[model samples]
Target chain A: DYKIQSFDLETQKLLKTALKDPGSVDLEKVSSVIVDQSLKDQVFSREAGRICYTIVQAEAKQTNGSVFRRNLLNRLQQEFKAREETRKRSTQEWVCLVSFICNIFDYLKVNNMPMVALVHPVYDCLFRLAQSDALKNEEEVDCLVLQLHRIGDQLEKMNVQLMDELFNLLRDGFLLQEDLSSMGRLLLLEILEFRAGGWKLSDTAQKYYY
Target chain B: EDYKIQSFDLETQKLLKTALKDPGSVDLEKVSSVIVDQSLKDQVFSREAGRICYTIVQAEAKQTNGSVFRRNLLNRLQQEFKAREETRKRSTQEWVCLVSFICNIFDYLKVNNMPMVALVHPVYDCLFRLAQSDALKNEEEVDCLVLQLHRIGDQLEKMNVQLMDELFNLLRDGFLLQEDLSSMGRLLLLEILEFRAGGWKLSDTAQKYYY
Candidate 1:
């Protein structure tokens, strides 16, 4: 699903310049292409995702690449936190936002971004969305849920820190404000239950592992 | 007495604002029934009404005008139900049915304990929500649901029952509250809980919630 829409100046620049060295790229300049008000469908799909992955993949090579990675995630967290408070995007917009994050995580994993950076902010946003009432009814929640599963899976194969963090969060089972579809609920549960045996102390973890 | 409808978030408030288009026309007798059922096992009366009351109370520690909404809603239900006796058209059996219907649900909440009480709140909410929307052309049945939810809340209180603590997640999004949890699973949970100090069962998945 790649379209070269004219509106996305930043992404067009990004695609043209994708896969360059992290040293040459301006972090804020590149990440904003995704979060900034640019609205082309390609930005939400694999192509824009590739561009984002390229940016982070470059950053991962830096001596202080963690800072660059953290900054990218912080931008996402800020936008998600700001939903309907300062501005509102349709669920599709939110879904596109997920697409962007997916790209970062997908890309960064191939690189070496810190585990906390990927997992924590996402946990907060997911927690925040869970805490929201209006968001549940929006169709975008299904996308949010699916994106989370993918990221969670990616984190498991890649980062043990997120694995532990995500396990605890899901096991604790935070209440969400919106109504999750049954599949969404089960997905959350599955994420919690996935490889959960390692974390539990005695009977649950020990027997399952043993 | 002035508990605001704490359970609802902004979007729900948006829907409700629309539903109460003719707020004055909200039927009172309908308000009372969601509080209690006419049997040992409660039948779902109004899904939305029962849902709003319980979830609002559960989620809300205190909503500002929440008390006002609760008071007005309750007062209206009371006035309407009181008005019925004036006509003397109803029989003793009809009036006796009131307390009778209210008992089982309360009894079940007591007998089955937290596990059973946990299951009903959202289902009640679900039913009430459906009736309110869809143009609310079925006014009589919908009104009864309004009363029905009111009943669920009141009885739970009088019975001195408190729901399971982690209920906010469940209150906001109780997985078992919806259709996913089969009735057999619930009964098995109850039967298991009954045998032990807390609970046990096998009708459902083996995945256990470890505190």
Candidate 2:
């Protein structure tokens, strides 16, 4: 069900640009900036806009506000590792998860999730990392750290509705099991805190917690 | 005497065809003539040559409805061929062909829902060919063959299930040898497990392992 057309042309173009060597603006450097800027822009357009704005603002307050960028890269690496671990368990199980995810996404697509709402921030972040100029300067380690921080900030600001939907879909398919240690609970709490900060809460608002 | 050899050759061909069509329908007396000679048996059992001989013996036993004999022989052969270096060594083309021929016999038997017989030679032969032949130089060709082998395994698995039921029936009727049944059943089940775990469906793994 993964159509070739599902990949965005603009994102692909940005990726290609980022991969190129920069005489003035190399592809990697250009991608890194584009990704960071795009994440900020897209989050601002979503329910998590305020949170995204604050994280970017907090980052900008630093001598180099590249922490958010580093965090995002780290998150991507973690996601890849999770995928590898799942594949190692059983190919059939991996196939089942992929099939389930694809089916849910296909439903989401049919329901007309806004394109910018769905793609801008993630795509932009990815493109920015790919084109990070810091890599050329031998500051790749710092750049990666910055990317991971950004990811942490963004995850904190993740929309409750999106999280609920993902959890519900996995639960319905018997994919997600509730089995977490104290450390896992703490990590979850930390992530939730980041997301809560990204929201615009009111004193009178009844905050329902999971 | 040459006429006897010609007749024997004709009979072997017929037996091969029966094996291809109905592996249980083979003429064992005739197959035994070509296969059981002291020289032929020695050649078949030789560290270098015995696996091919065993495959023929196993195939002939299956044809004659000597399932007990076939199972015992196969178990012995499997044990004898267990040296790590033996597996590491490159299999000769003739050996590969012999193995392939034995597997073909098993394929025929499985398809016909007969009792299982061990035919290790064909699997080794196919692997050998894949390793040695320029025909599988490309990734795609290698992958295609691996996929084909998996499909064959899948089909044989289904056939084995049916044969298992037949075996139960034979047991109930008191026609099958219960003494040999456990060993043969375990071996067949183990073989199916090995086939599934081999990931022969994956082209890249097949190519990497074969080479």
Candidate 3:
């Protein structure tokens, strides 16, 4: 009922040509197309996600590939935030966008790019998702929780500062609603001190204890 | 004589007074250890080594390295304290000081980051792996790993971006050709090659060709 039956001729030709030569697809153009709400359902169609995957991977290996990677990131963040900000955001879209964010962060870390710059903007945005009331579904909240970590793991992998920033955010974000799990918050606090202070607290601090 | 590190010099002390300063920017040169005054072991890399490698080698160290030495050293000292823990009112100051010394080094590497070398810098890890230096032994002559690090440091002095790229390849080819190398030399070179450049691990360009 969801995915478009076929792309318009312009997109079909682009995908076909890019299939023959991976370099044929222009990444900025494809990135824009994938997130365009018109093609959002089409992009998720059978075999269509793989087409998006190959195009994103194709964008690597250039002298200025990180440049393209950043744009790739910005493009995804727009989709993510636009969806995130919407009331009763679709769980499918949350699952869809967050997973793509995970893959690109994985790609960047593996390629040695690690997208350190994107850490600040995207982190602040996703954290907003955590700090706000926008998420109406358990799955949406779960996605934001896991998604916060997926990007955060890369930030720490790239630079220790990124980890500290996250620790700061988590510290500042303490006092969240009691119904949620505390495991994520627990690890974030303990690990930072051990890594930086060389000592794990014998007990959780007043800063957080439930 | 004035080179002795003070108790408050430790990173933990700094954190209490400062507001949100992190490990990436604190300067260690001003407080360089005695090993440095003689020949300033780049307080820069020490902090880097202290930050990244400490996390890595700490387990190796806690178990295999100084567990016995520190335990026995403190144990004997505790016994010798003499006056029911108060010699005309004695204190645990000595014991506290040594623990802080170790913690201080770890903290400086992590908490102070200014002018710090990247954990993956060629020579950065050379010192970090000192946690594994049970090999240093009682003998006075420099250990093989330390000697090897000296030679590698010289190579780094001559290093450039081109050399970095070439060194990366040389490491790849050396293994493929199975070139015989003194154990430490190959280890030293590989340390640089595998380091994420900015991080303590991974290939640097994985995010795509980057600085």
Candidate 4:
């Protein structure tokens, strides 16, 4: 159902400025961009979801962006559920969707966002990937590892026992899967080590403070 | 004869104590099994198994017999790693897997206080050499260096500041001084340098976005 119709020039211009740097844009103006029914439909469309998440994530980092963040999330959730029921999303599609979800959730963890609604879905998304034959597939395994690297620490802190069981299953079952490629196995081992080592910052992150 | 028996007993006691202190025995098969059989056969990469291999090998190396075992095991590991290297013409996947494997080895060795000079340095040197290659034309080589930095660059720096600094200095010389690198590759190295300067402790934003 993809189409090649020209997008509204004005909306495209605003999106360009907004995306160049979300922090650079005015929160109110972007929210207004979302208020127009025509623009909102285009802005929150599945294809547009990627851009919206980055925008929403930036807003989430703002002092008073909570209101916009919540409303935008509600609209996005409506689109998500509606889309989910309509047809099955491919592994690639779900990977992108879950990546956006987890990334925004990364922002939400700092404060403000009601993470209550997010905790289960995020857990479910990661658990599905981790429990799958994803270990045997390189790209799928990368997807699983990246999400955990992003939020596994927080997930463990929020619900220690739950993460414990999940990690235990992975430690014993998935990490030992013989069919796993060396690259995937190493990636899994790296994440497992990170989790076990108290989610210490990776080498890159370790350099920020000192 | 009774006195002779008493003297023999004393000699035997001394020999027993020496053997106990410096037992010259190690099961090379058993020591290497964790990596060879448990991990590499299907690329399982079990942390527990890796640890098992290191723990046993290190323990055995301290014994009189363990010295040969440790040397033999190191030779075997070096061989296996080199063998993995030969398949480079076939697939980047294999090469990346090899990179990950060495990084994992670096972690295990560091944690166990194993000698870095022997195994880790050779690979680190090779990576730095690759970084100095035509990274503008060959992203793969440069990427491996970045992956190494991502996985263990911090610890490597902490362990040996001179070596780490030298590596980065060489990187700067190649990518910056010569100015032959892509903007993307240059930015990647700059980011890593900044990460190192920051002491590798990521803030929330850096943590979320950098990876």
Candidate 5:
């Protein structure tokens, strides 16, 4: 069933940037607003849904947080199925979706989501992108590089054996793609080298990568 | 209006536009070519460098904030300037031009509201390195640094007065240590100190050595 309810303007503004820039808004206050908001099917669509999910991810340390996550995950899977049913896969849409999903991984990991809850979906999403031509273009590659720069350290620590497959697919497969520019190749390789160098982010601008 | 900015070669125009517009994908070689090539006069080179730097800060402010594109473009340009200074015989004209370019970046960082602290150390390293190099032997380099201080000394004093004081101290010390400093160099350094002492404002009868 389609619903036509909408968030009030102040609530919309609060939700838009609530999770985007931490400390810009009060996280605890936003969490309360989210916990109390209506869950119409329309609310689980587009940017609103992604923002809610990130907020929920941030609330992993709260009491009854698992229930909140379960409620959202169920809605997300339902939404995914709805989109997949109506999908031809726009590359731009996929890029945005992948970025959202990657941030979800980072949010969960950073906020102390359980290892079992985090690992299964992360690898599923990671390998899906790694093996597919979804991220074969230059912009998509940069998107992955940006996400990996944030989350790669965690992945390498979680499972090097698995991360090696992702890295190999990247270097041998993705790096060889003819569509990527020299700059894109350089950024990807710089991130790869960053992982090699113990994932210690440097302050020096000379060799700093994204 | 006269045909300003129309005298430079077409490649310089095109490369500069690309560097400022889409720095993320720009070719480093093409962008650096204009800065180091002898196709332009030294004064023309210095003005063009300021133009390029100002446009870069503008682009960084307009585009993605603190994007990798701006970072890569700056590092590449700095490396080119460094290589030129190290590889070639000391051409005071080019050296002075590059110093002005560095200072122009500092100037535009304020103009565009970009964070100046991240760039503080690198800019200091560049000026300090120049003070230690053969660039100090030339009067033009001394004049260029003085001109830059006059241009941005007030803002620098506000941003970090200690930095302003240290740079002034360095210039004075370097001038005195150089027994072979030109009479013009000593006069310029002495004038800069007096200018700062008067709160970075020009006296009614004060003359500018370089605009």
Candidate 6:
């Protein structure tokens, strides 16, 4: 609940902006909105942005999903703590962010979107990946990347109606495909290297592969 | 021997003086019962008479007097009996005979135009049992009891409407006097409202709807 309070302003603003023009808002800005203080430590490590992006992609694809609202609330809390420590953002800006996030759920409700469909699956998958032995073993923060790939695969094969139906079916089972996919991508990205010769564990080496 | 005789005489004199002070005020029938034997006098004085004596003495000392005391004592007994009747109504009947007897008492009371008092006993009994017995402890049971009460009230309202029609017919036929019919009709309406109020108070749905 305290986590919810931290990012409420940003969420509120984002919700309002989304209501007017969802397509206009940058995906990066949208992804950064989280409210919980602990989430920064829990979710946003050195490779957190990449993880978040993968989760978002999974959500968009409607595959294995995460609890988006909860995650967003948590992330905003991290931003609030950052600003409070550094005094970077104005108080008004902080307040606005908090209000926005707090009312975002309400806005979604009023707009007739199913909250469970919108948030729960993605969060559930990310959470599972974050805790998974496979992700832990690889020392990879690239579960998000793996998740993105899975989501891409799902999108190529399934339409929105099929995805929704699949979600409903999977919801009855243990594995939430969308969230799992997102977390898988994040773990992959976190561990795998993308560049050459910069550092052994850097993007080059693809340490996870070795 | 002379000393003992003198002492007994003195005690007897004192008792006679006390007894004679308000001889006219005493109920002669009760006094006659007490005076029949030495044992009976002792029992009355030690128990029943002692209680009455103490109450009168206390009342006199406080300057509060007797009429109010009598009224209060009677009222307390009436309330106590009302409570006891309610308790008795909820107990399981011994057999078919007992159930018939109980129903007969209710019928007799209703026929005598005292249905309010008659119904009050059973409703109060039901409430008292619910509080005392563990049979209806859960929320579901409590809710069911409330629903049952509401249904009973609805049935009672229908009965009351029928009763009113009957009373009107009686009035038209000269079988019931206008003054008697009017009083009875008013009392019945009050009972119906009281039952309805009890039903409303006990219902959770009613509370939520009103809130």
Listed per prediction, chain B TM-scores read 0.26, 0.30, 0.22, 0.58, 0.69, 0.20
Lowest lDDT 10-mer window, candidate 6 chain B? B171-180
Off by over 4 Å in 5: A1-210, B1-7, B14-41, B56-69, B81-90, B110-115, B130-136, B174-178, B208-211
On DockQ, the stronger of 1 and 6 is 1
lDDT of 5 by residue, B1-211 (tens): 1212455678766766776776655664555555445322456555445556556546656665644444554665567465655533555566566666656656664545553665565566556655653666777667777777777667666776666666755664564445566766656665565466446754432342222
TM-score of 3: 0.33
lDDT of 4 by residue, A24-52 (tens): 66655664454333222322322344455
* TM-scores for all predictions: 0.37, 0.27, 0.33, 0.39, 0.40, 0.23
lDDT string, candidate 3, A1-210, tens digits:
223345577876665665445455575765565455332442352223445445445555433243334555677666655754533446555555655555455444545665555565555445554553423234445545455444555555656554455444443333233333334434433333333322222222223222
Q: Under CAPRI classification, how is model 5 graded? A: incorrect
DockQ, prediction 6: 0.00
Tens digit per residue, CA lDDT, model 1, A1-210: 223364457656664553566566566766655556423353454345555555665666654475455666677777656655432646555555555555555555543553455564455545444434424444444544555545655555555554555444443332322345555454444333333322122232122223
What are the Cα lDDT values of the candidates?
0.41, 0.34, 0.38, 0.54, 0.54, 0.33
Provide DockQ values for all models, in the order shown. Answer: 0.01, 0.03, 0.01, 0.02, 0.00, 0.00
Candidate 2 vs 6: which has more DockQ: 2
**Model 5: lDDT of residue A158:** 76
> Which regions of candidate 1 deviate over 4 angstroms?
A1-14, A21-27, A37-49, A56-74, A80-89, A109-113, A131-135, A138-140, A154-210, B1-211
DockQ score for candidate 3: 0.01
After superposing candidate 3, which stretches have Cα over 4 Å from the reference? A1-19, A23-29, A36-74, A77-84, A87-95, A132-137, A148-151, A159-162, A168-176, A179-210, B1-211
lDDT assessment of candidate 5: 0.54
Q: Where in model 6 is the C-alpha error above 4 Å?
A: A1-5, A8-24, A31-210, B1-118, B133-211
Residue-level lDDT of model 3, residues B1-211, one tens digit each, is: 1122233336633531221123223332222222222111232332232332233223334444533322332233233322222321232332222222222332343323322233223233323322122212211111323333333433333333343344334333342233334344433433432331222332323222111
TM-score of chain A of 6: 0.23
Stretches of candidate 4 exceeding 4 Å from the true structure: A1-10, A14-68, A75-88, A109-114, A201-210, B1-211
Q: A106 in model 4: Cα distance from truth in Å?
A: 1.6
* Candidate structures ordered by TM-score, highest first: 5, 4, 1, 3, 2, 6
> To one decimal place, how large is model 2's interface RMSD in Å?
23.8
Better of 2 and 5 by lDDT: 5
| Candidate 6, position B211, lDDT | 30
